[PDB]
């Protein structure tokens, strides 16, 4: 190991003394004129290939995109409260544990001549991952402040609510589009994810929003029989995959795109030949290899990745149990905030699966969109098992699909869809229980973000502990549910359509908002308790 | 550093007595002491700067945005002059990211520099372990940055110079 050349001898130096160490100069490279040629030519060639594919529905006939360009953007009381939480968090709320690592990595990025992992693996690069680190490096030039650096992440959260509320939910069905509880649960669950898991420089926000854009592009290119939006989705999916290693959740959105691609390519094939419609999408796939390998050579990246695995912490597909075992720790990774997010998305997913089994799809739901949202969530959760490290702060990848499942679960559990009162009661008992289980930790955030926050290292308790009170209410709901099972109760005779009743039939929006408030209140009350 | 504030002593008092009882005969309960001090404190920002290369732990980053980490040259690193680090447990459990086994800077500095701990205090939260600050002094201070004889040479795709060495 060389840290220089040290001698405790001094004076004149004689002939013979020659130390000639060749420094490991690899990774310190710049593209050859030939490598830059194929890149600029090849990436323009792809736009030329995709431009040729764009005119193919315009050649098959039809009016220009009717809803896909821009849906009428505005405000709503909910849109305010969402962005209020988003913007307030940006100042008072807790950031990710790695935003420091990423910052200092991007900070030294420029002089280095490449994207080296600064703190580990003998200065080997990020190789396929962290392309936006180069973008964060440029952004640092303006300023280096939690508020400045996390600002694209603030805009991403806003862009995210936008995509969910205006592109996802209207597409999800009539009951989704019309139900206000579906928009309240959608915001409630999305914020329960975005706030604790995505307030920082980690790739999670980029992926969480990237999986929504992939879905939207397919979803909108499937309804318009246009292949270009399916090819656009591929590019969004390819970019989010190489966002960070946690990018594989994007495989969820991608694999699901296969089904509609064979549908769009076989219906609009109109005797055009496979080579004419597939070559531009094959180009759209490979187009990220220009970005991934913009500065590093195949050998460099491959050799570095095979090393980074050997040397540092690398885990297996069958190790994913750790990720969930970490989630149940009385720690910042097992925090109320983090337990609740996951636990509730699982409940949302479960009631959505269960409904799609009893009935063909969720009653007031659009067939294709809903199935593809559950699809992307199932595939995403499984895809996650392949990550080399099993942290809970990775659940922030689910932030997009959380909103979409919030909408679906609410619609699936409404009086009209879920007809049994007893069944709606047990579902409520489940929402109470995930929260009972969520309040069985510490309200803890990690690092300097844990300063004087309420119950930062204790079980949130007032006079008996939230976990016990919630479990009791959860058992109370079951006895009410069991009473309906023997009494034979319906939607109309139990109580007469009041506001308190109205609220109770949307338990996810109640539970999720309850927690969104609690988390913002807790980190405000943290700053408050750290007075001067 | 045993800490208590100047505000906790009234303007009425002018002389101070350091009393310290002990009564455990057990082998490891015991106490050591030094004369009192009113520390001449200057904030970290004005002391370390933003032009001095520092070894910012991967944890302390968005917290110390002003202070600059040591840039890395062409296989060589800028020698850090300071080390900002998280709280006791936070470094006890998160510092192994940079250990020699992992190939991190904490392994390069482990050989080149001698780490002297400079005492530090949190703004008004006197009793909170905010973290720690270290002054990093080289073993051979007469020694200064290397004579890097670097030159351009284009290389192939599949090309690899030497294998990457795994630490123990």
């Amino acid at each position: 190991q060389i840290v220089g050349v040290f001698t405790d001898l001094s004076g004149p130096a004689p002939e013979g003394l020659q130390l000639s160490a060749t420094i490991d100069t690899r990774y310190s490279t710049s593209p050859t004129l030939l490598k830059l040629l194929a890149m600029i030519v090849g990436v323009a060639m792809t736009v030329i290939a995709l431009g040729a594919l764009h005119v193919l529905d315009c050649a098959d006939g039809r009016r220009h995109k009717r809803f896909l360009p821009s849906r009428w953007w505005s405000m709503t009381p909910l849109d305010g409260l969402v962005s209020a939480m988003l913007v307030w968090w940006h100042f008072v709320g807790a950031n990710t544990a790695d935003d420091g690592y990423i910052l200092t990595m991007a900070r030294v990025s420029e002089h280095a001549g490449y994207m080296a992992n600064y703190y580990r693996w003998f200065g080997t690069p990020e190789s396929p991952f962290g392309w936006y680190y180069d973008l964060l490096a440029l952004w640092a030039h303006v300023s280096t402040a939690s508020v400045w650096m996390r600002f694209p992440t603030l805009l991403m959260g806003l862009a995210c609510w936008w995509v969910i509320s205006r592109e996802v939910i209207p597409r999800l069905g009539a009951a989704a589009k019309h139900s206000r509880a579906a928009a309240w649960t959608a915001a409630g669950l999305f914020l329960a994810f975005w706030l604790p898991l995505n307030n920082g420089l980690r790739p999670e926000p980029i992926i969480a929003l990237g999986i929504l854009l992939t879905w939207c592009s397919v979803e909108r290119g499937v309804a318009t029989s246009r292949l270009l939006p399916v090819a656009v989705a591929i590019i969004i999916g390819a970019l989010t995959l190489f966002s960070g290693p946690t990018g594989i959740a994007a495989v969820g959105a991608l694999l699901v795109a296969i089904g509609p691609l064979k549908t769009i390519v076989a219906a609009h094939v109109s005797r055009f030949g496979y080579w004419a419609l597939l070559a531009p999408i094959a180009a759209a796939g490979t187009v990220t290899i220009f970005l991934i390998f913009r500065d590093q050579t195949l050998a460099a990246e491959l050799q570095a990745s095979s090393f980074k695995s050997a040397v540092g912490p690398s885990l297996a597909w069958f190790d994913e149990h750790i990720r969930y075992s970490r989630l149940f720790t009385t720690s910042p990774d097992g925090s109320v905030a983090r337990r609740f997010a996951v636990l509730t998305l699982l409940l949302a997913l479960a009631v959505s699966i269960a409904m799609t089994l009893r009935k063909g799809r969720i009653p007031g739901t659009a067939l294709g969109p809903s199935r593809r949202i559950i699809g992307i969530t199932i595939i995403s959760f499984l895809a996650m098992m392949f990550t080399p490290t099993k942290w809970t702060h990775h659940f922030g990848v689910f932030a997009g699909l959380a909103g979409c499942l919030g909408a679906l679960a609410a619609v699936a559990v409404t009086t009209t869809a879920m007809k049994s009162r007893r069944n709606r009661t047990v579902f409520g008992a489940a929402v109470l229980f995930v929260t009972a289980l969520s309040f069985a930790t510490v309200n803890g955030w990690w690092y300097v973000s844990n300063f004087g926050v309420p119950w930062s290292n204790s079980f949130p308790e007032f006079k008996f502990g939230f976990t016990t009170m919630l479990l009791g209410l959860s058992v109370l709901a079951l006895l009410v549910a069991a009473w309906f099972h023997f009494s034979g109760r319906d939607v109309s005779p139990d109580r007469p359509q009041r506001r308190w009743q109205r609220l109770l039939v949307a338990p996810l929006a109640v539970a999720t908002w309850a927690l969104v408030i609690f988390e913002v209140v807790s980190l405000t009350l943290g700053m408050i308790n750290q007075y001067p | 550093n045993l800490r208590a504030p100047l505000s906790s002593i009234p303007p009425e008092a002018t002389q101070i007595r350091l009393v310290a009882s002990d009564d455990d005969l057990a082998p490891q309960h015991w106490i050591a002491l030094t004369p009192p001090r009113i520390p001449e404190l200057r904030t970290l920002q004005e002391v370390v700067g933003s032009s001095d290369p520092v070894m910012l732990d991967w944890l302390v980053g968005l917290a110390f945005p002003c202070q600059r980490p040591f840039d890395h040259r062409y296989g060589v690193v800028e020698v850090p002059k300071w080390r900002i680090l998280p709280d006791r447990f936070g470094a006890e459990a998160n510092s192994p990211v940079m250990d020699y086994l992992g190939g991190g800077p904490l392994g390069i500095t482990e050989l080149l520099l001698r780490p002297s701990s400079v005492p530090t205090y949190l703004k008004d939260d006197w009793y909170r372990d905010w973290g720690s600050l270290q002054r990093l002094t080289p073993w051979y201070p007469d020694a200064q940055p290397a004579r890097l004889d670097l030159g351009t040479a284009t290389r192939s795709g599949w090309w690899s110079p030497a294998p990457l060495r795994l630490s123990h």
Partner: peptide
Amino acid sequence: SNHRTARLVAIIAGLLGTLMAIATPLL
């Protein structure tokens, strides 16, 4: 005939944009 104006440029550019990208790391 049968809108072959875009059909040929989609094949020749689609295959080339793919081929160049696969070549790119080996360069």
